[PDB]
Amino acid sequence: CIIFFKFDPRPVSKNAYRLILAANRDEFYSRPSKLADFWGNNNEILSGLDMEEGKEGGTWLGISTRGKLAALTNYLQPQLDWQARGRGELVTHFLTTDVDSLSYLKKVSMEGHLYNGFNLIAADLSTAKGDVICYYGNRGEPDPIVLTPGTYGLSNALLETPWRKLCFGKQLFLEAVERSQALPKDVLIASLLDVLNNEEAQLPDPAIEDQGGEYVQPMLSKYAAVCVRCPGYGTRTNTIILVDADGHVTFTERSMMDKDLSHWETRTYEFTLQ
Numbered sequence: 001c002i003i004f005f006k007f008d009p010r011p012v013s014k015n016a017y018r019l020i021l022a023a024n025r026d027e028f029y030s031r032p033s034k035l036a037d038f039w040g041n042n043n044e045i046l047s048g049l050d051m052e053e054g055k056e057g058g059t060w061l062g063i064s065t066r067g068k069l070a071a072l073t074n075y076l077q078p079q080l081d082w083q084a085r086g087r088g089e090l091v092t093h094f095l096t097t098d099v100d101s102l103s104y105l106k107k108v109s110m111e112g113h114l115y116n117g118f119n120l121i122a123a124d125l126s127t128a129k130g131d132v133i134c135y136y137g138n139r140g141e142p143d144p145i146v147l148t149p150g151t152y153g154l155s156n157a158l159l160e161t162p163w164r165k166l167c168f169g170k171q172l173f174l175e176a177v178e179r180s181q182a183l184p185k186d187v188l189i190a191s192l193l194d195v196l197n198n199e200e201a202q203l204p205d206p207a208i209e210d211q212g213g214e215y216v217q218p219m220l221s222k223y224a225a226v227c228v229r230c231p232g233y234g235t236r237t238n239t240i241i242l243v244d245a246d247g248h249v250t251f252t253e254r255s256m257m258d259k260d261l262s263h264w265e266t267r268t269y270e271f272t273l274q
Contacts (some may be wrong), residue, residue: 118139
């Protein structure tokens with residue numbers, strides 16, 4: 001997975017964005033998934049959904065019209081614990097409850113040992129009260145942190161770990177944002193989709209080799225790109241989320257269909273934060 005986001009809770013100008021987020025979901029192509037649409041008790045949550053039997057309703061990335069947003073990446077490991085709790089519930093539980101992001105991540109931190117490795121971003125979006133974004137991962141430090149305004153990247157190590165693909169992707173992301181600055185949002189979205197589909201591998205990467213051990217050796221030549229193309233495994237979903245200064249949200253999700261590299265469906269939804 002890879003996620004880039006620029007957050008600016010106090011935009012200094014009227015056309016500035018409070019949030020620009022661009023994310024790839026990398027997963028085995030066999031894992032059933034539902035394309036993004038609104039769900040929940042008052043149709044207030046927008047996300048794709050995991051449909052693996054026994055884990056239905058989990059997700060990796062979502063936003064609610066009440067101003068909650070969360071995102072998860074897996075931590076790369078040489079081996080997994082199959083009796084562990086599924087990580088898909090971590091985003092879902094934040095989006096469906098009424099807990100602030102830092103309080104929620106503190107609760108998660110007390111339970112992090114029950115999951116395989118993960119990284120979690122949780123955000124409270126409020127036009128009136130100011131946006132807050134927090135971070136916790138169960139393979140790093142035990143206390144969640146409140147992030148300062150800036151542009152962040154997160155892949156399958158920790159927040160801002162300098163994997164070459166993360167640094168390269170962050171530079172492309174910054175360039176695309178700067179380039180589509182004054183322009184209509186369709187141009188920004190198109191530029192970010194192009195970043196997320198960059199297949200240029202960034203090698204050698206001894207950090208990936210060290211963390212992934214034997215598991216990653218046969219994947220390394222393709223895993224070290226922003227857009228991952230391995231046998232039966234890789235970038236299946238590109239998601240862009242924009243929140244402008246006034247709280248208007250644009251959510252764009254491009255999904256691989258029929259397990260086919262030439263078949264894609266992209267959905268864009270708009271709403272205003274309540």
